[PDB]
Design a protein around this motif. Sequence first.
Motif, PDB file in Angstrom:
ATOM      1  N   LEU B  41      -9.799   1.439   0.762  1.00  0.00           N
ATOM      2  CA  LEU B  41      -9.208   2.725   1.104  1.00  0.00           C
ATOM      3  C   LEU B  41      -7.691   2.706   1.153  1.00  0.00           C
ATOM      4  O   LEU B  41      -7.036   3.609   0.648  1.00  0.00           O
ATOM      5  N   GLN B  44      -6.480   2.812  -2.394  1.00  0.00           N
ATOM      6  CA  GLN B  44      -6.575   4.087  -3.069  1.00  0.00           C
ATOM      7  C   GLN B  44      -5.444   4.973  -2.615  1.00  0.00           C
ATOM      8  O   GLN B  44      -4.624   5.408  -3.423  1.00  0.00           O
ATOM      9  N   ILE B  45      -5.410   5.235  -1.313  1.00  0.00           N
ATOM     10  CA  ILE B  45      -4.377   6.070  -0.709  1.00  0.00           C
ATOM     11  C   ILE B  45      -2.991   5.665  -1.191  1.00  0.00           C
ATOM     12  O   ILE B  45      -2.149   6.520  -1.442  1.00  0.00           O
ATOM     13  N   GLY B  48      -2.824   6.160  -5.091  1.00  0.00           N
ATOM     14  CA  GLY B  48      -2.947   7.579  -5.289  1.00  0.00           C
ATOM     15  C   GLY B  48      -1.661   8.313  -5.000  1.00  0.00           C
ATOM     16  O   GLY B  48      -1.165   9.057  -5.841  1.00  0.00           O
ATOM     17  N   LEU B  49      -1.146   8.114  -3.790  1.00  0.00           N
ATOM     18  CA  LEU B  49       0.081   8.738  -3.321  1.00  0.00           C
ATOM     19  C   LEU B  49       1.141   8.517  -4.382  1.00  0.00           C
ATOM     20  O   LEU B  49       1.715   9.449  -4.927  1.00  0.00           O
ATOM     21  N   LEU B  51       0.831   7.837  -7.339  1.00  0.00           N
ATOM     22  CA  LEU B  51       0.424   8.435  -8.602  1.00  0.00           C
ATOM     23  C   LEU B  51       0.589   9.946  -8.523  1.00  0.00           C
ATOM     24  O   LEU B  51       0.896  10.596  -9.511  1.00  0.00           O
ATOM     25  N   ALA B  52       0.357  10.502  -7.339  1.00  0.00           N
ATOM     26  CA  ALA B  52       0.493  11.929  -7.128  1.00  0.00           C
ATOM     27  C   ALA B  52       1.940  12.325  -7.303  1.00  0.00           C
ATOM     28  O   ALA B  52       2.242  13.452  -7.628  1.00  0.00           O
TER      29      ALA B  52
HETATM   30  C1  HEM Z   1     -10.297   8.023  -1.203  1.00  0.00           C
HETATM   31  C2  HEM Z   1      -9.615   7.441  -2.211  1.00  0.00           C
HETATM   32  C3  HEM Z   1      -9.547   8.096  -3.417  1.00  0.00           C
HETATM   33  C4  HEM Z   1     -10.568   8.198  -4.349  1.00  0.00           C
HETATM   34  C5  HEM Z   1     -12.041   7.860  -4.108  1.00  0.00           C
HETATM   35  C6  HEM Z   1      -9.896   8.718  -5.547  1.00  0.00           C
HETATM   36  C7  HEM Z   1     -10.491   8.858  -6.758  1.00  0.00           C
HETATM   37  C8  HEM Z   1      -9.832   9.403  -7.824  1.00  0.00           C
HETATM   38  C9  HEM Z   1     -10.472   9.681  -9.065  1.00  0.00           C
HETATM   39  C10 HEM Z   1     -11.946   9.546  -9.381  1.00  0.00           C
HETATM   40  C11 HEM Z   1      -9.509   9.968  -9.933  1.00  0.00           C
HETATM   41  C12 HEM Z   1      -9.642  10.062 -11.459  1.00  0.00           C
HETATM   42  C13 HEM Z   1      -9.051   8.982 -12.376  1.00  0.00           C
HETATM   43  C14 HEM Z   1      -9.168   9.332 -13.852  1.00  0.00           C
HETATM   44  O1  HEM Z   1      -8.445  10.234 -14.329  1.00  0.00           O
HETATM   45  O2  HEM Z   1     -10.002   8.716 -14.537  1.00  0.00           O
HETATM   46  C15 HEM Z   1      -8.362  10.180  -9.113  1.00  0.00           C
HETATM   47  C16 HEM Z   1      -7.258  10.769  -9.593  1.00  0.00           C
HETATM   48  C17 HEM Z   1      -6.168  11.107  -8.897  1.00  0.00           C
HETATM   49  N1  HEM Z   1      -6.062  10.828  -7.546  1.00  0.00           N
HETATM   50 FE1  HEM Z   1      -7.334   9.882  -6.418  1.00  0.00          FE
HETATM   51  N2  HEM Z   1      -8.572   9.143  -5.313  1.00  0.00           N
HETATM   52  C18 HEM Z   1      -8.408   8.801  -3.988  1.00  0.00           C
HETATM   53  C19 HEM Z   1      -7.279   9.060  -3.312  1.00  0.00           C
HETATM   54  C20 HEM Z   1      -6.148   9.629  -3.813  1.00  0.00           C
HETATM   55  C21 HEM Z   1      -5.059  10.066  -2.957  1.00  0.00           C
HETATM   56  C22 HEM Z   1      -5.056  10.122  -1.432  1.00  0.00           C
HETATM   57  C23 HEM Z   1      -4.065  10.465  -3.805  1.00  0.00           C
HETATM   58  C24 HEM Z   1      -2.712  10.716  -3.506  1.00  0.00           C
HETATM   59  C25 HEM Z   1      -2.285  11.433  -2.392  1.00  0.00           C
HETATM   60  C26 HEM Z   1      -4.742  10.564  -5.076  1.00  0.00           C
HETATM   61  C27 HEM Z   1      -4.201  11.249  -6.078  1.00  0.00           C
HETATM   62  C28 HEM Z   1      -4.791  11.361  -7.275  1.00  0.00           C
HETATM   63  C29 HEM Z   1      -4.103  11.894  -8.430  1.00  0.00           C
HETATM   64  C30 HEM Z   1      -2.712  12.491  -8.538  1.00  0.00           C
HETATM   65  C31 HEM Z   1      -4.980  11.738  -9.443  1.00  0.00           C
HETATM   66  C32 HEM Z   1      -4.595  12.240 -10.803  1.00  0.00           C
HETATM   67  C33 HEM Z   1      -4.009  11.178 -11.707  1.00  0.00           C
HETATM   68  C34 HEM Z   1      -5.061  10.448 -12.489  1.00  0.00           C
HETATM   69  O3  HEM Z   1      -6.228  10.863 -12.454  1.00  0.00           O
HETATM   70  O4  HEM Z   1      -4.721   9.460 -13.155  1.00  0.00           O
HETATM   71  N3  HEM Z   1      -5.994   9.972  -5.131  1.00  0.00           N
HETATM   72  N4  HEM Z   1      -8.525   9.816  -7.815  1.00  0.00           N
END
Ligand code: HEM
Lengths: 54, 54, 442, 49, 406, 195, 100
Positions: B41, B44-45, B48-49, B51-52
């Motif tokens: 976790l 990811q966070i 993700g952050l 990446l966001a």
């Molecule tokens: C609990 C943890 C998380 C899980 C299970 C998760 C899962 C995913 C999934 C399934 C994708 C798709 C990847 C793809 O395009 O193949 C994704 C994309 C994304 N997530 Fe998360 N995510 C999580 C947390 C976060 C958090 C908290 C952020 C940032 C604040 C975040 C931001 C994004 C963004 C911007 C994308 C779009 C970019 C991309 O898909 O490459 N993610 N996330």
Amino acid sequence: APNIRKSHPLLKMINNSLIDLPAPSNISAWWNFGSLLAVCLMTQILTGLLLAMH
Amino acid sequence: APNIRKSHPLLKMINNSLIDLPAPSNISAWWNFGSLLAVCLMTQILTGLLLAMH
Amino acid sequence: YAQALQSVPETQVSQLDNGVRVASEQSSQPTCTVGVWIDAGSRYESEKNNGAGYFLEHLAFKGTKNRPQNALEKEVESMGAHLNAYSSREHTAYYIKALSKDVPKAVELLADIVQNCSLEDSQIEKERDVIVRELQENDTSMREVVFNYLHATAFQGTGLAQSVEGPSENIRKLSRADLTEYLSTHYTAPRMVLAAAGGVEHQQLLELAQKHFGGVPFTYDDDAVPTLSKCRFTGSQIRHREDGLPLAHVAIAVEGPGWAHPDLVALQVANAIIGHYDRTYGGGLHSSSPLASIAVTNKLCQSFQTFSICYSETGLFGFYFVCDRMSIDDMMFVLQGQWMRLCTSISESEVLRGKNFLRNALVSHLDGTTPVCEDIGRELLTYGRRIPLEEWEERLAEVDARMVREVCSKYIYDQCPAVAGPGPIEQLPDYNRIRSGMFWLR
Amino acid sequence: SHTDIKVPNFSDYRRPPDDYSTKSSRESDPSRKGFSYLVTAVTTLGVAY
Amino acid sequence: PPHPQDLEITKLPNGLVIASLENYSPGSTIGVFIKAGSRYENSSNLGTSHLLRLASSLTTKGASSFKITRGIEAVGGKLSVESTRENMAYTVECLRDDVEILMEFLLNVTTAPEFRPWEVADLQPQLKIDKAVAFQNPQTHVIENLHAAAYRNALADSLYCPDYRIGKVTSVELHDFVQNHFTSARMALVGLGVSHPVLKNVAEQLLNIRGGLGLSGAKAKYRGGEIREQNGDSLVHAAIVAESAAIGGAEANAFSVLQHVLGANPHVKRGNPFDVSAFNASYSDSGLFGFYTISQAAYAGQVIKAAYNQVKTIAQGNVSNENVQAAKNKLKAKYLMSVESSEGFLEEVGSQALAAGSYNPPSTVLQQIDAVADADVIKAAKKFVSRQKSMAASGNLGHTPFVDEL
Amino acid sequence: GLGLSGAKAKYRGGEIREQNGDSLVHAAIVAESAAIGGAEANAFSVLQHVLGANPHVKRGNPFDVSAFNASYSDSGLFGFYTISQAAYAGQVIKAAYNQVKTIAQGNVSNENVQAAKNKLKAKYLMSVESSEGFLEEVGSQALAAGSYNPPSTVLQQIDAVADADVIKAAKKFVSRQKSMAASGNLGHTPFVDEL
Amino acid sequence: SRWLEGIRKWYYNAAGFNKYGLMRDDTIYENDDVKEAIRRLPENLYDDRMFRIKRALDLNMRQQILPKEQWTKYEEDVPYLEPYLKEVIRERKEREEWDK
Ligand code: HEM
Ligand code: HEM
């Protein structure tokens, strides 16, 4: 335990922070801001989240 | 108190959850997943952050 | 003071054509105490021999061939003399205390024992059951079982690991023979010392001994003293648990240097710093010995003691506390913290006192005749000669801070300790933990 | 009675080859700790990277 | 040179006897003996002596409870207090000139004790334990009750504060108790390894209560008591006594010699694993004689009657002028031996310098033990058998007898 | 059937004092005597009443004093307990005692006996109104004897004797060996050896 | 020229902690020293102070003070703790010193 409000791992947290919590009696009105500050936060996070959605 | 690791309101929280915490000795390797799940976790966070932001 | 020491009479020493070393300290005291101190202990026993020396002790007094029980006892009582003794792991002794008007008589009595114990096949069988009982009494003294267990694990697998009294099996079965076998093997002049202190004059002593100790050596073995097999220390623990007891006992320790070594002084000075506590003290203000202070402020224990028990070529430098089921941890925490502090950031203000407190012990170590004799007896036997207070003084009168650290740390820091604990010890953390309590996060 | 109790044998069983009585355990262990800590020293090291 | 320098005694204008003896030891010990004790307590104020014995380390006027404890410790000193039903000795050891440094605290502790209402209120719970550990020895518990049944007034008072009174002693009762007993007429500044003049230059500052006699323990009336403590410990502690003795009283040495004339007799006279000895306490205006017997339960009866019969027949002429010589010579030893260890020896120089004000030399002290014999031992025992007796006991007891069964 | 069997109670002249400073002493003094079913019994019951006003009406300051009396199977006790102020305990005990004493030396008018004799009659008849206390009566006898003495004869028995006994019962007291007990400060309280 | 005594009295009445009915010492902030100090205070005083302090919290709770009459007058304020508090502090500085 009896109370079942002072035994439960979570309620016990609440009943010890918003009930049964020892507060002085002469607390002034200036002490009302911590409260406000907190609810002020709940409010922002809400309206914000709901606003970020657009 | 002496330890000063078991008296402090915050450390006491840690020293009671990642140290001094009573765990059975025969714990199997299957128990390693709660840990992983948690760090999973954090990861990811983070990613993700970061990446966001783009 | 220094003069008082300088004016303290020298301790006469002289060996016989036999091998026995006869030493003493002439005082004035109408009374005195003389006795022989043997270079024998349980350490010298075998897996099947162990306990002999003790079985032996319980018979040493019950009479000789030259004069049976009823008599020996009668003859000593009748002269107002006191006969007592003991045996450790590497050191046994028998001593008498009379009016220095009887050096010759005492001296004779002595010899007659260390040379002709009746070993009445009928008496033995009796003491056999006396020990087996006496042993079951030594048992509930959790203060001693703990130390035994310490040695056990500390020197596991070696001669030291065996307890001075021995297994019940051995005692239940040692033979009239084995006892004799133990006597005629270790009670030899070369390893024995005849010491005294009182109104006695050396010569009258020598002669008296030279007269009743008519031993004669033929071969070279007899004349020589065998060195023992080294004992391996082992960082380990042993936990005899039972929440059934009122409180717990803990003992942790590192290997010690051994008599011969000098540092045993600096190291002896360090222990004076952590000292000891005991609920009957009056002192939440105890000079240093924070361990004691802390022990009082936070109610860490019923008591504790710092000790540098040593042997021929090894030893044990540790500590032992008695505590309630619930304060075991903090106590250990706090103490183990002091060792570190001890060898990592000690101060002059500390060592200064440390010394003094020692010197005061060092001296009261010789309060009376019986005790003095004990030093001569020992000193010779373990050191080689006698160390005069005048000496001990210097030795430990030149220990500064940096000296304590350098040493303590040399013997304590990051070493794998040996702990032991009986009683309600559920709260005592695992080895790994007390282990990493051996290095300070400097 | 406790006098009736011995510590089992870890000899060979577990003890590393520098540990078998009549030989000071101490001359051989600053070498024993040296290894272990080296392994740990290396991990902290590899990890930093 | 020869290590001889006559122990000088100089009774100050107060009455404060000062005795010393420079034996040349590397370490010395000074000590204040006093005629205080629980022997002076009332149905109230009880234990005040005991608590007083624990307050040793509380703050004073010349030094604080802190300064005194660490003060003494910085030197390697030792402050301690040994008390009896009728005498309290405040000692303190050390070495070299570190004696001089030691004295200040000792001086303060005994004459400038300003017991603070907190410090005591915070100290008293100690009693609860100091007492609790001591009582882990059945021997002490029975002796406490012995005196209880031996007397009716003073001296029959406990040596360890009674339970009911623990947290009730007052900061005042402590002053009052001191004020009335810690007085120059009943004190002595004894000491070893010191220059007598130097020990005198101190006695001068040690002057805060000319008081003189002060209070005064009521003459100890005797009683034929008997208290049994049922508790089933598996082995009985039984002690039997009969009014007698008195320190300084000629009749004394007699028992000391009977104390030895007896023993092997009672011991060598019994059945099964046990223990038995001749008891003997010699007090100021009274004393006790008899014997305590640690014996297995069920066998207690046998073991008591026996030890008793021996004491009995002993009087009926069972003492050869031999037994007397043996004894007479054992005391000589025990005396001479129990004086090697300076502290026990110092106890001797003091006890006399307080009671008499003199110093009986080993020569005459013997001349006195020798001075009498046989035409007394046989007799001392008689006094026992005939006089009224008072017993005490601890343990199962069920098989144990009462004095009315002898 | 019989099963076990309590060993015959041997008597003793005991005395144990409990020091505790409660501010007021409880002192009781007794002398071997009485026995349920034993003729000598009723005597004390009547002395138990013949006494009381006597010890009570005989003292100084606020207190309390009564005549004690337990009648056991193979033994019994007689005497009196006295709750008295501390320092005054001494006075209060000696007194209650002197009264019991002189009582034997002939200080009992054939009057006092009638009064008493008639008080027991009452206390008996009264302490039987409340069924449970009454049931205690029907049982105690049906266990000891196996009978039932009617109120008629139970009285006939209390009446059956008098005076030529009360004076005497007290004597037995004064003469016989005594055993005391006490609680409280005590410091001003005496021991049996001081009477 | 201007009495500290004149001043002190000015400030006392200026502060106003008396309109609530409590002594000067009833206001000292309870740091470590004052804590030890109060614990040594005799029971008479402890309960006295306890009540005062509570009577003050209650006034304050009601937004009302005490009638002019009941106001403690400067010259009658009893420094009930200062003596104690003082020894505590010098007892301590003694130790803070020795340990060096
Ligand atoms: C609990 C943890 C998380 C899980 C299970 C998760 C899962 C995913 C999934 C399934 C994708 C798709 C990847 C793809 O395009 O193949 C994704 C994309 C994304 N997530 Fe998360 N995510 C999580 C947390 C976060 C958090 C908290 C952020 C940032 C604040 C975040 C931001 C994004 C963004 C911007 C994308 C779009 C970019 C991309 O898909 O490459 N993610 N996330
Ligand atoms: C700690 C509470 C918060 C504070 C102090 C805060 C403050 C602000 C501020 C100063 C603005 C500017 C308003 C303007 O344009 O005049 C704003 C805008 C915004 N906030 Fe927050 N905000 C908070 C939390 C949030 C959260 C947690 C969200 C949603 C997840 C959020 C989402 C936004 C969005 C989307 C805007 C842009 C829309 C707009 O400005 O009208 N806010 N916030």
